[PDB]
Amino acid sequence: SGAIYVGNYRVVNRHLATHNDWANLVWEDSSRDLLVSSTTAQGCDTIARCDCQTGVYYCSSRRKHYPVSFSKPSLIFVEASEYYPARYQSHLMLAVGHSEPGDCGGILRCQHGVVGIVSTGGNGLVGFADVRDLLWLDEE
């Protein structure tokens, strides 16, 4: 589990969104596994606006932050899970790293800020849903 709190927005994995998230919905996209809801309190996270391909992510199944090299956001095939059938997920970046069911939501960050959140994994891989192209998170 995990979320990004930027301004008056909460960014979470769409497959882990709560009823309160759906009842205060700002934007959602199943193809990216992202959902954004509105919040009453202001958040402290800042979004990265860069082209970094190295950063650090939080892995809840190890209570550790790991440095990783990750691919550019692209369309990747993801195996069937209890949340989605086997399909192509867009704006996904892959890296070599530990991930397990429960690790979704952990933040990936670079020197410029938050890059994205854990969304996929398996066999020594971890995939992150990019959020750097969502410019509207920085305003309104």
Q: Does 67 bind ligand A1BQM (CB under 6 A)?
A: no
Of 18-26, 30-38, 52-60, 130-138, the segment contacting Zn ion by CB under 5 A is: 52-60
Q: Are 106 and 132 in contact (CB under 8 A)?
A: no
Nearest CA among 32, 59, 53 for reference residue 95: 53
Scored b (16 or more CB within 10 A) or e, 58-76 reads bbbeeeeebebebeebeeb
**44 belongs to an annotated ligand binding site:** no
Rule CB under 5 A: choose which of 16, 26, 52, 56 binds Zn ion: 52
Q: Among this protein's residues, is 33 annotated catalytic?
A: yes
For ligand A1BQM, which residue of 117, 119, 128, 137 counts as binding (CB under 6 A)? 119
DSSP per-residue string spanning 19-41? HHHHHTEEEEEGGGTEEEEEEEE
Q: Cα(82)–Cα(91) distance, rounded to whole angstroms?
A: 21
Whichever of 7 and 132 has its CB closer to ligand A1BQM, that residue is 132
Q: Does 37 bind ligand A1BQM (CB under 6 A)?
A: no
Binds 50: which of ligand A1BQM, Zn ion, none (CB < 5-8 Å by kind)? Zn ion
Per CB under 6 A, 118 contacts ligand A1BQM: yes
Distance CA 36, CA 19 (A): 12
- Give catalytic residue positions: 15, 33, 104
Binding positions for Zn ion, rule: CB under 5 A:
48, 50, 52, 110, 112
